[model samples]
Target: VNSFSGYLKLTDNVYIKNADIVEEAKKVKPTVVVNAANVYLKHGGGVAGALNKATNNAMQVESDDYIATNGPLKVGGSCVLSGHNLAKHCLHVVGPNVNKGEDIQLLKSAYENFNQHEVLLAPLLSAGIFGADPIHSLRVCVDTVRTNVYLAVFDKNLYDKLVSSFLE
Candidate 1:
């Protein structure tokens, strides 16, 4: 990790308040950056989907270094209760604010952009909540997106515990 860490409080608008929505993203060096965003319910999935859609589906992280998308590998859909795709090694859990139908479609779209070593990170909650419950959303996020990630909180302590809990 880089030594230069900056912290910003979340204003009324969570995404804009903290999320790294850059006007010219290419100027940034890292693949992704998380801020002190808040979400009362959940908006990450929808926000991610909207961003994905807005960016011509190209802004979404994708990897061409490796390929896999056939038969069981075909990934995508919309659902509130479905687990992550079994074909792939990772899981992707969106937050609760999103409607089930749209989430499935977003998942499907992300698959087209995924690969073996790399995974697309997306929001799983609505922007502008003080703190996530850390049970339903947090556990699901751990179980579903173990290898890949969209860490809003980005706390190693929280993430480490989830990883350990899932193993058992």
Candidate 2:
């Protein structure tokens, strides 16, 4: 985490963090870690892809079964993974595909479903390969997540920009 002045407050409990996601995930040790994935449960890119590799594909195996039965996850639909490497539990969410452009709104709704959790570590949904803007996704995260939300940032340059943008 960069030694920023402080967290940018959204509410009493909600705030933003400009930190390395992997490090923050270990440090915070949150109860739930959110991952952005596709309807097919393929963890090939973004935070989902990274965590899939990190956990030795445990999450993908679990998600595959869910998607097979559920017939492709819809927007805002989610599945859970437990006994993973990093977090105690994982919430695999299917966000919007950037190719569709307007799908970013669906990503916001996915975060809205995240309630009743103590602490959640999340990246800006669809801000990566899915092409959603970080600033927009950050706003969506803050407005929707009811409990304590940790915005895990990987790129230092992006983190710095988000910090400055939030402060501004």
List the global CA lDDT of all models: 0.30, 0.72
**Ten contiguous residues with the weakest lDDT in model 1:** 80-89
In candidate 2, where is summed lDDT lowest over 10 consecutive residues? 1-10
Per-residue accuracy of model 2 over 30-139 as CA lDDT, tens digit each: 67888876767888877877888877888778878776778787776777768376778887777777766656668767887577566677777777787778877777
Instruction: Report the lDDT of model 2 for residue 127.
Output: 79
Best by lDDT: 2
Give per-residue CA lDDT, model 1, range 20-125, as digits (tens).
Answer: 3222122222233322111211223333433333345432233111122211222232221111121111223222223222342233233222232243233433
User: Which residue runs does candidate 1 get wrong by more than 4 Å?
Assistant: 1-120, 125-135, 153-168
lDDT of 1 at 95: 28
Q: After superposition, how far is residue 109 of candidate 2 from its true place, in Å?
A: 0.9
TM-score of each: 0.30, 0.84
lDDT of 1 at 60: 29
